[PDB]
């Protein structure tokens, strides 16, 4: 979460950017189109050659929006509310791409701000751009609606006493399908039927049962686990999306009736909210 020290560093860096915001913004877009060509799929209607008016205009628009973000960093969701709607409902850019632009904005500022681009300012800027990206993508699907909460409680109620059982299967599925997650468990027997995997699955299922019961107050209900993952276990956040998918596959295989398209959508949203809470204190 952005601290006032974080906000102080961003304001200092962006102020130094000043009236170059536009030029630098254009440069950041040019760098992304060259380094990550898949991003050009969102601009078939643009002349993407170097120095093009369209690219310069995109750069300037993005820079002014970032300036507005900087100037209202304590109220970002409301500052960028129109832009969040527009990316969510019209542009419909896949959220992975925001990371790629963020990286190219950091490379641009680094190349232009040798004095200011210290390790702490780098860290603060990275957090700032991830916060912006989160706010720009927060209406793609949105919070958990009352329909969502109903669907989740309906499906999880049906899980019932099998919570532990399905938890263990979810982990088994993940270690087999995504072998890199095994690096966080060098001290376990990971063979099929392992009691260590079973105990891990039940713990996680018990935590999920708690979140379901506290679906309106998850950050407090999950607080100690958020602390633990962030400060001790220190699991890279990419891994939470992998377990979430494996939980979904497990539910699908055991709930033929219950796993409708609508319930699928609600569960995926739920697990992403859980994952967000669990990684909220990493930085």
């Amino acid at each position: 979460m952005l601290s006032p020290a974080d906000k102080t560093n961003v304001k200092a860096a962006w102020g130094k950017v000043g009236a170059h915001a536009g030029e630098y913004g254009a440069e950041a877009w040019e760098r992304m189109f060259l380094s990550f060509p898949t991003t050009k799929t969102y601009f078939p209607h643009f002349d993407l050659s170097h120095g093009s008016a369209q690219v310069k205009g995109q750069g300037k628009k993005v820079a002014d929006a970032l300036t507005n973000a900087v100037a209202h960093v304590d109220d970002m969701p409301n500052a960028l509310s129109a832009l969040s709607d527009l990316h969510a409902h019209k542009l419909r850019v896949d959220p992975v791409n925001f990371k790629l632009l963020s990286h190219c904005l950091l490379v641009t500022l680094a190349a232009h701000l040798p004095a200011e681009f210290t390790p702490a300012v780098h860290a603060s800027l990275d957090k700032f751009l991830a916060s912006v990206s989160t706010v720009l993508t927060s209406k793609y699907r949105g919070v958990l609606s009352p329909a969502d909460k109903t669907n989740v409680k309906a499906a999880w109620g049906k899980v019932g006493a099998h919570a532990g059982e399905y938890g263990a299967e979810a982990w088994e599925r993940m270690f087999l399908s995504f072998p890199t997650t095994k690096t966080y468990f060098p001290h376990f027997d990971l063979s099929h039927g392992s009691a260590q995997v079973k105990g891990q699955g039940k713990k996680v299922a018990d935590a999920l049962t708690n979140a379901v019961a506290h679906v309106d107050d998850m950050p407090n209900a999950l607080s100690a686990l958020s602390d633990l993952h962030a400060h001790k276990l220190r699991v890279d956040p990419v891994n939470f999306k992998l377990l979430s998918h494996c939980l979904l596959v497990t539910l699908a295989a055991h709930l033929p009736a219950e796993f409708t398209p609508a319930v699928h959508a609600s569960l995926d949203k739920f697990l992403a909210s859980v994952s967000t809470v669990l990684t909220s204190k990493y930085r």
């Binding site: 898949t38 799929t41 969102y42 419909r92 087999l176 399908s177 699908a252 398209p261 609508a262 995926d268």
Partner: protein, 146 residues
């Protein structure tokens, strides 16, 4: 693309039981419901307002069949996915302008649908083989992007 004998056998055995029409329409429909921004490529398909409309939309069903039929042909050439999908790769980049990340989302949705349809038979080792396969196909479809 390389798999163990154990993996390839599991993939081909299950696929023999897949009705590509029924599964294809299910997979594309769930993609549009679960990840609604993917709707940006199908504005001509009719109303996509609710899961009810998406799932029974006839154009969704038909496109789904086309997509998984092509997927099915890929499974006949697992050792050369890149050469098998080259033309479609180019089509998706140059004519349709589709972000390849969408190939990954569809891959995961497809695995969910297989689990939903086959239940207990879709065991952890079978899933793991399909995860390799859907990633191999997504990588093959992205290969000619520029």
């Amino acid at each position: 693309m390389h798999l163990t004998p154990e993996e390839k056998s599991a993939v081909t055995a299950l696929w023999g039981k897949v009705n590509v029409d029924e599964v294809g329409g299910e997979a594309l429909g769930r993609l549009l419901v679960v990840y609604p921004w993917t709707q940006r490529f199908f504005e001509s398909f009719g109303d996509l307002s609710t899961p009810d409309a998406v799932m029974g939309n006839p154009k969704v069903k038909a496109h789904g069949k086309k997509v998984l039929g092509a997927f099915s042909d890929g499974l006949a050439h697992l050792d050369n996915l890149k050469g098998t999908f080259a033309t479609l790769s180019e089509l998706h980049c140059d004519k349709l302008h589709v972000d390849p990340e969408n190939f990954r989302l569809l891959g995961n949705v497809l695995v969910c649908v297989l689990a939903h349809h086959f239940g207990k038979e879709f065991t952890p080792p079978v899933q793991a083989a399909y995860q390799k396969v859907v990633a191999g196909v997504a990588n093959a479809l992205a290969h000619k992007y520029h």
